[PDB]
Design a protein around this nucleic acid. Structure first.
Lengths: 96, 114, 79, 206, 151, 98, 127
RNA sequence: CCGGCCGGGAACUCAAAGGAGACUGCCAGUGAUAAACUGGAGGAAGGUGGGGAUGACGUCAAGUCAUCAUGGCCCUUACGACCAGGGCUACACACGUGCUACAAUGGCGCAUACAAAGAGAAGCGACCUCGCGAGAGCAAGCGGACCUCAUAAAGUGCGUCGUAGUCCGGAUUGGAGUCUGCAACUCGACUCCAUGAAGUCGGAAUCGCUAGUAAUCGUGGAUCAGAAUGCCACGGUGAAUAC
């Protein structure tokens, strides 16, 4: 049921939400040349689990990392099952 | 005529002759001709001696053949003195950039040996 | 091959290097980081790099100027 | 195994969508997740009430959910208090104000989901599955239309040779896009395994 | 292929000459959909052939196509011993189709510089009977006359 | 010269909604432009139909977001006071531009 | 005052407006030779005009869009044929005998799953 | 104000709903007076116009307990979890699917007119500036017929290379770097410079395709922090042959 995997995923989402977007938009601004330093020796001290690259877009029905779609937030099997059940609005089966 | 080579580059164009010389390709040959003032569409055959001398000075002001070849040689030798991953792949005859060796390593492997 | 605007040094690697040059000559200690950038100013360490099940010592010399610490530790075993 | 889902192929013209709301992508994903959470908890709470369908409409800070039910009195409870209570907890789990709606479905043994749920409950009670299918097809013919097909699959008497039994009288034209075939599936858990029941039935003349 | 006949597909004649036969020659010489390149090659080679010949181009081109095209086609029907070669009356569509196919194949086999020059040399050698496609035609003809059985 | 833009999954629902919109604009009489056929956006997804392995078997889905714009240019005081609560449709997305 | 014909050739749509005037034509604010008269498939826009054989009788003005060069040429030709439809029905019978009246129903085919191209199957070995 | 300029029915492409239309309908011949077959007029398509979805009862104890669920068995102070490194990317070989080419139908420099389908806010990001470069800032516009991706390319005009292992092809290798991400040695893509293996159209054998098809040339999307020669999808040119 990969509940360990999903708990790891939601824990790194929570830790990235806690250590992101408070100074992350100023990283490139401080680092880049404005048209070594104590500032950059402080900037190279950030941890590794806080980055959004740690996250993997997993399904929310199952937690399966493969076959994901961003618009439905689901794996391919459960996208198909919800589409055939009618639980997804507007997802008529294409026929062109 | 000829500068430092085994075969005559004449009866051709100047960019082709300065690609046939070792260590200078097409873009650096065009740079050499632009800094020498020699047009590209003329032939290196039936060229005057002074223009050939300016071409010789243009080749000499950058790194010449042989010297860049031994520079590559001691770069590879320095990697072997390191004994790092690049030096180990150079000794084993395996690719260095990081491509696969399960199949399609045949340029580094040479001909196929059973 | 990396960015020319900033080298990558670990903070734990930097404090090991600073403590080792504070002490002077020292027997090798086991370091687990292979992601490192060395310098000619700090050429002279005897720090050892971990590659899986075996640990190998690394004695850096004068000619390496920007190489990784993991290049000298072979991760794979061949016959 | 090789059949298309007939509701999923009838959604374009005949079967209405089970959710009819609109959303753009970055809330479309969250609306599907909240729709599954609401539907799963509502089905778990009202499996005793034996509901047929759960239809969700959202104006993007509100939810209004319509439950097609065989017995509306069980869901509305005692003077609206119980239905107000699960409306409250649906609002609490969705984060938006919630409206409740009850739609009575007539002929519960002609309703497609309730036949699968009743056969599932009968196999939980461990009566004979063959008699369960004969009672389902007999009651559908007695009090409704003239076409239904039931398939009961998996661990039928514990036989080594796998065998799927399906019972047949009436017409179920699945390739015809005009006809309103309602189809549903259900799973019955027993000490020898899980049994899958799939029912197709049409309701009315065009 | 089995139930009923499916005919060949109708083509636009060439702009410069207005001949469906020459447009079919363009379509046969064609590779990879490059109709403009193929018809430019055909126009250049026909201009070169007309310049080299100097006689009536229509009469000369029919003499060349008659010298190239086969009057008896080779066919294996796998009936007796799985190798027969019966002589049978040939369609004119098959005649000029095999003619352009052999002319184009001999143009690919010829080792000159430009394909317009290959085609000009092949169309001149068709008239003066020195063609590789012509020699292929007598290969076909002598095979048919050697293996003809029902006559 | 304000424009009302409408998005839906069901074209019948959006056409009935904009028909009631133009009927409420024209129920007394005014110089009102009708809804425009602004193009429908199609999201198409090809996903695998088997859980384990597929080679040729995939199922294909499409969302059609239908898009209309009515562009009310004539000001009427009763239309402004009561052009709300006409369609009462929960599947219609409404935006206002100028 | 105006004689109009649309014409369509599977990705190209044209609009042909004709006054009775000088025989020089214009296509997308430039002449035929400046647009694709150097290119191939140039004679198809002359085929309805040379089949009936008027040259300087009428004055054409064509705006074409979409597709490629030969699709645009076929669309311009077919807009000329709808202009001759607007002209008369005896010439409609003559163009139906020739083969220019019919709009070409040959569109490109969709790419299908499990296939490299529209109809090209991937190669599979015997084993 | 040469940038589609603004009152204009909106003529017209176009988009997007309601419909009409094409149903052997009408006429000749064939067929037994039947079904039906063939041909012709009209017409945008004539004989399920084209394509797609739609895949019956069942077979292969075919595949998935690794998407999920579940019967039995097993660990449950270790067949569980958290970590730092590494491996999933190895390499004397063998096979399958593709990409690039072996060249003149082509290679290099300049000029030149279009496409269709799309996606874009933890984004798309024109344009200012510098650089023979991947590309570096508070730059407008857009949550989408407006703004961006986005210069379409084969092709067409030239100048040149003149049938060579070559102005063909790019493998491999060495220097100097960008972008992404805390961090590209194992183990991302590229461009700046240099070298230029094999390759001379491939044996037995074998594969796809009947028309907008095969070939050939570009483009977009999914997953994606960044990374497709694969997959899905769209358009340009567009055959030959079915006796």
């Amino acid at each position: 049921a990969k509940q360990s995997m999903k708990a790891r995923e939601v824990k790194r989402v929570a830790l990235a939400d806690k250590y992101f977007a408070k100074r992350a938009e100023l990283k490139a601004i401080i680092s880049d040349v404005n048209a070594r330093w104590n500032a950059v020796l402080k900037l190279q001290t950030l941890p590794r689990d806080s980055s959004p690259s740690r996250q993997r877009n997993r399904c929310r029905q199952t937690g399966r990392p493969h076959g994901f779609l961003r618009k439905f937030g689901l794996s391919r099997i459960k996208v198909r099952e919800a589409a055939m059940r009618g639980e997804i609005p507007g997802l008529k089966k294409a026929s062109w | 005529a000829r500068i430092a080579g085994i075969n005559i580059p004449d009866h051709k164009h100047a960019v082709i002759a300065l690609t046939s010389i070792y260590g200078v390709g097409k873009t650096r040959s065009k740079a050499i001709l632009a800094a020498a003032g020699i047009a590209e569409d003329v032939k290196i055959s039936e060229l005057s001696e002074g223009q050939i001398d300016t071409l010789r000075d243009e080749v000499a002001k950058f790194v010449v053949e042989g010297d860049l070849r031994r520079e590559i040689s001691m770069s590879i030798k320095r990697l072997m003195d390191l004994g790092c991953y690049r030096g180990l792949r150079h000794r084993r005859g395996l690719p260095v950039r990081g491509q696969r060796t399960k199949t399609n390593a045949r340029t580094r492997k040479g001909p196929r040996k059973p | 091959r990396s960015l020319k605007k900033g080298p990558f040094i670990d903070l734990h690697l930097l404090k090991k290097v600073e403590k080792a040059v504070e002490s002077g000559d020292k027997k090798p200690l086991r370091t687990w980081s292979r992601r490192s950038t060395i310098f000619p100013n700090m050429i002279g360490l005897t720090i050892a790099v971990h590659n899986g099940r075996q640990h190998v010592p690394v004695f850096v010399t004068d000619e390496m100027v920007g190489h990784k610490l993991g290049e000298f530790a072979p991760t794979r075993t061949y016959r | 195994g090789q059949k298309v889902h007939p509701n999923g192929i009838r959604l374009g013209i005949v079967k209405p969508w089970n959710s009819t709301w609109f959303a753009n992508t970055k809330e479309f994903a969250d609306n599907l997740d909240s729709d599954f959470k609401v539907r799963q908890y509502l089905t778990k709470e009202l499996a005793k009430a034996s509901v047929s369908r759960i239809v969700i409409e959202r104006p993007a800070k509100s939810i209004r959910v319509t439950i097609h039910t065989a017995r509306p009195g069980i869901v509305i409870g005692k003077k609206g208090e119980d239905v107000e209570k699960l409306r409250k907890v649906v609002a609490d789990i969705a984060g938006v104000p919630a409206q409740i709606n009850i739609a009575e479905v007539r002929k519960p043994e002609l309703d497609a989901k309730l036949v699968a749920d009743s056969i599932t409950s009968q196999l939980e009670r461990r009566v004979m599955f063959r008699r369960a299918m004969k009672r389902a097809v007999q009651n559908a013919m007695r009090l409704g239309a003239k076409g239904i097909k039931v398939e009961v699959s998996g661990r039928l008497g514990g036989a080594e040779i796998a065998r799927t039994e399906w019972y047949r009288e009436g017409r179920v034209p699945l390739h015809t896009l005009r006809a309103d075939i309602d189809y549903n599936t259900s799973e019955a858990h027993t000490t020898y395994g899980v049994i899958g029941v799939k029912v197709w039935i049409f309701k009315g003349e065009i | 292929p089995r139930r009923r006949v499916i005919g060949q597909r109708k083509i636009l004649p060439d702009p410069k000459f207005g001949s469906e036969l020459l447009a079919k020659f363009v379509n046969i010489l064609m590779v990879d959909g490059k109709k403009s390149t193929a018809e430019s090659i055909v126009y250049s080679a026909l201009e070169t052939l007309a310049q080299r010949s100097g006689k009536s181009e229509l009469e000369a081109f029919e003499v060349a196509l008659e010298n190239v095209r086969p009057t008896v086609e080779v066919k294996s029907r796998r009936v007796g011993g799985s190798t027969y070669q019966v002589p049978v009356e040939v369609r004119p569509v098959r005649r000029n189709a095999l003619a352009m196919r052999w002319i184009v194949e001999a143009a690919r086999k010829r080792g000159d510089k430009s394909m317009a020059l290959r085609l000009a040399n092949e169309l001149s050698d068709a008239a003066e009977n020195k063609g590789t496609a012509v020699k292929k035609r007598e290969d076909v003809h002598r095979m048919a006359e050697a293996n003809k059985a029902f006559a | 010269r304000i424009r009302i833009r409408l998005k839906a999954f069901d074209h019948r629902l959006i056409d009935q909604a904009t028909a009631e919109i133009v009927e409420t604009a024209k129920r007394t009489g005014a110089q009102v432009r009708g809804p425009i056929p602004l193009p429908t956006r199609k999201e198409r997804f090809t996903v695998l139909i088997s859980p384990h392995v597929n080679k040729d078997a995939r199922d294909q889905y499409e969302i059609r977001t239908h898009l209309r714009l009515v562009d009310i240019v004539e000001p009427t005081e009763k239309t402004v006071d009561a052009l709300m609560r006409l369609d009462l449709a929960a599947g219609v997305d409404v935006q206002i531009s100028l | 005052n105006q004689y109009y014909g649309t014409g369509r050739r599977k990705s190209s749509a044209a609009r042909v407006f004709i006054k009775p005037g000088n025989g020089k034509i214009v296509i997308n604010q430039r002449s035929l030779e400046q647009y694709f008269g150097r290119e191939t498939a140039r004679m198809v826009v002359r085929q309805p005009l040379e089949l009936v054989d008027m040259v300087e009788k009428l004055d054409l003005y064509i705006t074409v869009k979409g597709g490629g060069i030969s699709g645009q040429a076929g669309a311009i030709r077919h807009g000329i044929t709808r202009a001759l439809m607007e002209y008369d029905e005896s010439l409609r019978s003559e163009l139906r005998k020739a083969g220019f009246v019919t709009r070409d129903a040959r569109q490109v085919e969709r790419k299908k799953v499990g296939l490299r191209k529209a109809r090209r199957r991937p190669q599979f070995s015997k084993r």
